[PDB]
Symmetry: D2
Subunit: 312 residues, 4 copies
């Protein structure tokens, strides 16, 4: 089983990633780290513990990370109408899963320096401030990391801006730091995750599993889908999971090796992931971007995982 | 016939545009203005007069414009090996077509203010510094212009940089000015002009015309194709003409109405044409980008024009 | 007499400059050009004609220039409480002085190209967009200009921003263009004009002149002083005039030859005039900044001029 | 005694600071942290241990910090001609003072969280990357810190650039983070440290102390003075110590409370410490800049401290 560390900011997307990681036999979830994002770190951490409780994950540490982006201020942009805990779901009086005592950054450095080299695969699905920190704090980790698979960015697509994606836009500096280290980086951006649609056929499929987790996922997804993408006439889509999926089977998506950098001072482009697809491509490129997604193989994995989790 | 003003920096691309404008009965070439570009203004102006002589264009003024970009310094980047005049073609001792006495900017302002409103269509195919100047000098012109169709930019493609196109990168400021005026702008970028390939089938076709101008076009095209795109294993392509083609028949290419702006201070993005393809598109958009091109219809027009010009 | 061209955006400061130019025998006012600024171009032009009428200036053309900055949008920031025409003074039904038929930019190029080389001294006291245009339109002028003395910028002082002065901040691009041409530039910035205080002693002095123009100057100055600097407990100060003063007598202020450039893309520094006072100064420097001002010599000139104008 | 933590990048300046902190009875040196700078972190750390050995400092932990700036790459710029260890002084086979096991960042967080609130005063005299890290990792520390006194920046002076000082220019981001936290910041910039000259009178004075440390200081100072400032005809100056001096006696220098920020994306201004000295100053300002220095009082403190250290 491939050992990984899931750094996230729990929203349905991140939650589904956690289910997939836990549910799949090919993945060995080493720990779940949390980072500030659209919602405060605390809010996000609570959500993490809630999904951990629902998926009945035990033995896997959960640690809260950075509360602020490296340099940019955070736009709290809070306004969830019918939101209580996560979506319409409320938090239980007590949480089954407890919070690890150390800061997410320390945990990551610890885990990496504890296990054998090229064993752990980092999978960030939120801002990269947590990762960026560990890199500057413990340089020896970038060489020990097998590789980095993150959900974020977009070479020809953007949401937070015409050309930028949230996870990156949120803390451009952290993104830059990460993208410029000597390690291997696989960027699963919007261009990709946009293909991971939640067609009604898929919903029927998951609903068929008929487990508390399945129901949970659907309910929350539906709630948030309504608020965002349900403003238009087209299905919702999950992103974060796509990163985990790749780690499980590289054939779930096509990728292209092209250099990628982060714009940090552009009046209109700050936060954009610049990808050089130009004529002669460099022979050695530690970075690559996801392109086409295998719709079926992807969803099958999700369902399969949900089935495996069952009803804890 | 649609009245237009062709602002360019004569290189084969620009030359073909001139042939198409002149040769087509649907277009009424009001004047040919010139701007500094990859080559000096003078060099470029000489080239204009040469093609004017070859196409036997008479009665149409030719005026030289700005010699430097608004704010950016110009990278002369000159190094043409077997280049004499234009490609391997040399300049005649004297030019048949003479140079208008006024500066291109003035000529433009004059023409626009002379003819009736919404009659002239501006068609820049080089930097936009000439157009930007006229706008700031005589504001009344932006309302009198029917519309602006320019070859330049690229929303998902770039050459001068991973994300920027020459004509824009060369003078970002000028582009910005142009793209931010209240007038209608149709941007024919790389994404489009890339489809305008010069397949051998096409060459055979033009060579079949068998006129001095046809031969001229081929000879020069071949020469420059060799230097640039002939460094790899794929045909060359003409760009500039595409802009002229659109004016002749909007059905030569599909377009999309989306907001566009110019990044002016991005460390990696300066010069990029930022296009917002995001979810909800504004109802009123004076700007649109070219997407798919009608290969056949396009080339047919070019051939047709060459045929019409004949041998002056 | 030193021939000059006064490019301004009439506010009391610019008005006093006009008085000084007109009133002084050492200066030969060739023309008065107008540029957009804190107030619209039209507003500013009207003001110019009004002071021209008051100072009884005849034979000197007045031309309206650019209505918008080169690239930056203009912040109209209009909110003058008791403002009618200029300050509390109202416009007469008709203006004695008429408006020249050509655009300020053209007038400038014409004058320069008409007179003999190194004869005209350009004195801008508003945004530099007017000058910048002329330079790009007719390159031959920068060699024919004796030199450039402008009121604007600040090496250790700022007002529109912690580090930038209005005239420059308003149209950074224009400033940039001007500061990077091969001609001689004397920058009279805030560091200098801040010393030009309107102590009560000075007011008494000017009031003593007892002429319509004197009264006018005082009334307007007082009105505007109240609104701005009169928010604090310290006298008002005139700026623009200091530039003209220098042309009349270089010994009115001390200057330092140091390189100067314009920041165009700094998040906090855009518009700042960067001055390199560092250790080894270049031997050849076409730019210099004003430092210390001769308070008495300065004011004496102003009074003397007012005295000379008299009551037209 | 005022408790402090000295974060530095040992060069003579930093060394003198250490001597002053140690030697002065009013200061309680809690620990000495190290940051990458002009020289590598390791190089810098070795130098710290060397001065520690020379000053006979015992009981005070020494910890190495970050090896790279947050986001900017480091310009190693190494080329010391007659440099062996520190200046012409060589390292002993073994170091008396040992290196604390934890990373400087951790040590700082530990110390702060250990002692009582508003007890420790942070005194960084090198890049601020170390401080910035701790702040992002353990937010609770900014409230517990008494205040921040750092040597770096320049409001009207610069060295690394016409407008920027090294310590800040080296890692702009870090600086920004620090200057924008809710804690009190006292910036001792070039404007100030420039007045701390090492006149021959002073040298004679210190040489009079006649101790190994005094000799050490002089020898190194002389060596580096020769390389840098000795390229011109003016004495050398110590900077870093001035920060320490202020903590010992605020009356050693005059300060002004004015807002300060860090430019991060200016083409010419990146790294500059922007200080708003404009008309109305905010009532509440957690930041202030050093202005005039008490030459005698300063040196007296240095001498006194050297005297107190004696010959370990
Ligand atoms: Ca996420
Ligand atoms: Ca062209
Ligand atoms: Ca003015
Ligand atoms: Ca230092």
């Amino acid at each position: 089983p491939r050992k990984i560390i899931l750094d996230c900011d729990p929203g349905i997307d991140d939650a589904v990633a956690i289910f997939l990681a836990h549910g799949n036999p090919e993945i060995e979830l080493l720990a779940i780290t949390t980072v500030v994002g659209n919602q405060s770190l605390e809010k996000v951490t609570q959500n993490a513990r809630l999904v951990a409780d629902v998926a009945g994950i035990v033995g896997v540490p959960v640690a809260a990370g950075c509360t602020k982006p490296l340099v940019r201020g955070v736009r709290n942009a809070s306004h969830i109408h019918g939101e209580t805990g996560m979506g319409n779901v409320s938090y239980p009086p007590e949480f089954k899963t407890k919070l690890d005592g150390r800061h997410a950054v320390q945990l990551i450095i610890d885990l990496i320096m504890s296990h054998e080299p090229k064993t752990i695969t980092l999978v960030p699905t939120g801002g990269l401030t947590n990762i960026a920190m560990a890199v500057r704090l413990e340089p020896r980790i970038v060489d020990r990391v097998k590789e980095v698979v993150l959900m974020g960015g977009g070479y020809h697509t953007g949401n937070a801006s015409p050309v930028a994606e949230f996870n990156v836009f949120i803390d451009p500096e952290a993104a830059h730091i990460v993208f410029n280290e000597s390690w291997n980086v696989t960027m699963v951006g919007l261009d990709l995750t946009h293909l991971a649609l939640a067609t009604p056929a898929v919903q029927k499929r998951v609903r068929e599993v008929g487990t508390k987790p399945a129901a949970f996922m659907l309910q929350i997804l539906d709630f948030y889908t309504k608020v965002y993408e349900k403003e238009h006439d087209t299905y919702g889509k999950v992103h974060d999971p796509c990163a985990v999926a790749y780690v499980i089977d590289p054939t779930v998506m096509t990728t292209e090796r092209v250099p990628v950098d982060i714009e940090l001072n552009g009046a209109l482009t700050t936060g954009m992931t610049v990808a050089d697809f130009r004529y002669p491509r460099p022979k050695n490129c530690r970075t690559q971007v996801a392109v086409k997604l295998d719709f079926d193989k992807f969803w099958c994995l999700v369902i399969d995982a949900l089935e495996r989790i069952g009803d804890p």
